[PDB]
Amino acid sequence: MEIDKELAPQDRTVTVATVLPAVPGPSPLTIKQPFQSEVLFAGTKDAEASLTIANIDSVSTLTTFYRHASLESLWVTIHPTLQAPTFPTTVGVCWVPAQSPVTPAQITKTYGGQIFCIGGAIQTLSPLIVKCPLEMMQPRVKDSIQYLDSPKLLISITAQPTAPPASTCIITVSGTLSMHSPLITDTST
Amino acid sequence: MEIDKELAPQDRTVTVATVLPAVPGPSPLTIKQPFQSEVLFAGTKDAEASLTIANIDSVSTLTTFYRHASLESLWVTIHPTLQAPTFPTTVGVCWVPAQSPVTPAQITKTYGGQIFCIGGAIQTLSPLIVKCPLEMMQPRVKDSIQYLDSPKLLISITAQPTAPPASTCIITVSGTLSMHSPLITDTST
Amino acid sequence: QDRTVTSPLTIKQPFQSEVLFAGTKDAEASLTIANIDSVSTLTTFYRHASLESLWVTIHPTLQAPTFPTTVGVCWVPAQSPVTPAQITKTYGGQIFCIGGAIQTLSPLIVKCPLEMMQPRVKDSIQYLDSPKLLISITAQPTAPPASTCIITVSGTLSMHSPLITDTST
């Protein structure tokens, strides 16, 4: 009984982030909200992607009525589709604090930066999963101020020269949120 | 000796569900009924499916003679057929409360939802299994009231561009019901 | 009349309501005693109501003797697929010959197996397995002047927790 997911863990390093602590007072309640959003749909045309988890519409939508929200768990998944087999394609993944000057074309020049060969060869199909190291990141996704070391995702796709009819893989980002403190706004809608 | 069945477990989250409390009286007789019913037969044409485990034949018929039925174990499984090798196929799966407004066309936008690449000689063919987290669903598949958190199954299937002669895999749902309190009905058939 | 096992101040209100007048024309009837006049008006001032006793009865009448009439009843959980055209196929099955001509006798009774279906006829939620009655009259081929019998439903309700409605009328 083996698990259908496959892991390619990103190299780590000790890096604490500055974070504002709530004013002395009565602890407020708190819920947690899970989420999975689409990031990319590559395979056909060479394309890169560099998004800041802090602003994914999914997150945007959930934290809507709370003034405080942090990232419990976060991570990217690469799901090879029915094209991945016939169209091996290169994929680059790298979690970097939104406050880092790197671009997707520098994945392999950045410490964590990884390169994958989604599809083609033997065993090149189980969905990949790269857990974002909030340990190194700045998990504060919504606060009293706007932080900078917030989690940012990088992606680089090197499509086949003779492109596949359709996308070879779907790239989603998932995680769980932990938010609290109501934002006294208009709830009319 | 390894097991010919690989499982891809859906990520969960703490989510309770209320449920009609036991009516005053003495414990009642009860039975458990296992079951497996075909939900899909694809690989040949793009097609999605969104059925409520609460109403699938095997269940639909087993509960017919009781006023109450609860799911002991429940899970969906994909069996690649002899076409699976020649025709890699994308299959998406997601368990959500029958009360979730989610459509299979948006599985990858729903927390749990996952998508697999069943097929392609370049890799494994063991039956994939996605056990429905009843911890999250509303296990009461049949009762005195009409709960709505009841388990619902989402499937999405993108077939090969140049479809295979026949289906590349059979998608079935298995489980065990715990029923009791006979429902007066016509047993003629 | 069969078998098969498996703090708030409350009151008990007995009742009987005419459910069907027949014998003059073949006819099926599938009513859920959970909504019959009496019950309706009785539970009107409460939020919780359950059946203590429940049963159907057919009062043979004057015509009964001059016009034999087949009549069937069958108690069933409102959440059940059975239809009147199939009573003797059901467990609560039961058929009669009301006014088996020159017959006479008190009205036939048919205790509803409540220990076999949600007897809460009124609550905070909407139940399904509530008691539902199935009638099946098949009048004489040559219709009678009036009805050969009166089918009524009698029972007792256990209610409590006042419902803040208008008590005008």
Place this chain on the structure above:
Amino acid sequence: QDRTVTSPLTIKQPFQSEVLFAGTKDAEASLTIANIDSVSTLTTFYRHASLESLWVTIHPTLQAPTFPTTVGVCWVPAQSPVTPAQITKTYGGQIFCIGGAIQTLSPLIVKCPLEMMQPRVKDSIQYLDSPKLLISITAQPTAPPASTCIITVSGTLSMHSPLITDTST
């Protein structure tokens, strides 16, 4: 209705099935309730099934009054040599006059003496002394329009141990 002495999760399913429609033509019937529709479909998903209660009933109907009809029943161990043409010769013997014309009344019942025959209607082995019913209709010399009565078999089953069959339909 007579006398003469001598761990696995189970459920209880009640039932009633029309065994015979008669009154229009003399006829004998010798069925083994161990195989009647209801029972058949009910035990379908188990490997062990036994009878909790069992009895036959005759529902006099509309014609009953206009066409007296002799009808006989007799419960007997399926592994018994008796035939319908000889009911009153048997202990379970019992005869009626269904629709004794202008009669009427609920249907006649005849409890089967289960404590007198293997009530296991389904098992790992094939039993013989299982319950078998004997019917014996002798219609009016001048046939009636329709049947004078409906003979049904009602009972409760005690089952358990799922049988791995197809639950498609």
Place this chain on the structure above:
Amino acid sequence: QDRTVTSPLTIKQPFQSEVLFAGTKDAEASLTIANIDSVSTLTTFYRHASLESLWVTIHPTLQAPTFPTTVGVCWVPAQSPVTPAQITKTYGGQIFCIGGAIQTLSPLIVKCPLEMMQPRVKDSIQYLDSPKLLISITAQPTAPPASTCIITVSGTLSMHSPLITDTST
């Protein structure tokens, strides 16, 4: 059905035997159930036989409705001077109107007061106070096609101590 007080392996065999077929001609019958077919054949292989239960029954039939028929029964100690022409004069007295026309219903039963007469129907000695039945049919003045009813005797025997006879047939 009345009142008035005052080691060896055994088995119990139940039974029913047709004692009389009538309704077509006035007739008296005075048989001692101690010697009826069933009993006869049953006690055949024992030396000691006693009655556990015993009673007479009349199965109204098809003709019953078209031909009312007076019929009388009376259980009496075989060693008793009473005759059928005098049943209502006896304590076990009992009369009916089998096929009281347009009547119908199960067969009439008449429990024999065994705690009132030697129930040993077979023994080492010849008893006298054994159970004896008295029947008294008085058919319609205008005879019916067939018999209006069947009079049978049912009971249970308690036997023991094998009788060394031929078990060929």
Place this chain on the structure above:
Amino acid sequence: MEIDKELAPQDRTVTVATVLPAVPGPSPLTIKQPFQSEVLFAGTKDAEASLTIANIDSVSTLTTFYRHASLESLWVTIHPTLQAPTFPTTVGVCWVPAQSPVTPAQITKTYGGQIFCIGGAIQTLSPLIVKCPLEMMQPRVKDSIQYLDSPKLLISITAQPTAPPASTCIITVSGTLSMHSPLITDTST
């Protein structure tokens, strides 16, 4: 050091069988006899198979001189031949009590029912083994009476559209018997 056999265990459920116990007396001696019989030789033409282990000639032949015999261990094996590689084929297996109304075309509609893709893709070659659950069956293969819940095997083969030159796999049934009590018959032969 991995084992060349591969296992695909059939879903179980609690189901006891009625079984006659020997009359009070002196326990008799008992031997055990192993056995492997051919069941099917598919791959070339679509074909099904539904046999009752209780009457396999192999069993028939062994229990020949004993009036009592039960199934110690029982199971099916699918051995892909030199054709399995080039001719992926579908196989359905399901153990069901001889007293169950199911047919091989209903494998996937029966609780245990499994579907395999013998050959073609990667790792689709090690011999499969489906152990019959005597736990659920009626192990009594030869007794004082004839039982019904005896073990029965179901098989369904979906051969390649363009059939292989020869069979793609050999299907055998194996097990060990446990018998005792001599059947006083004529041993002339």
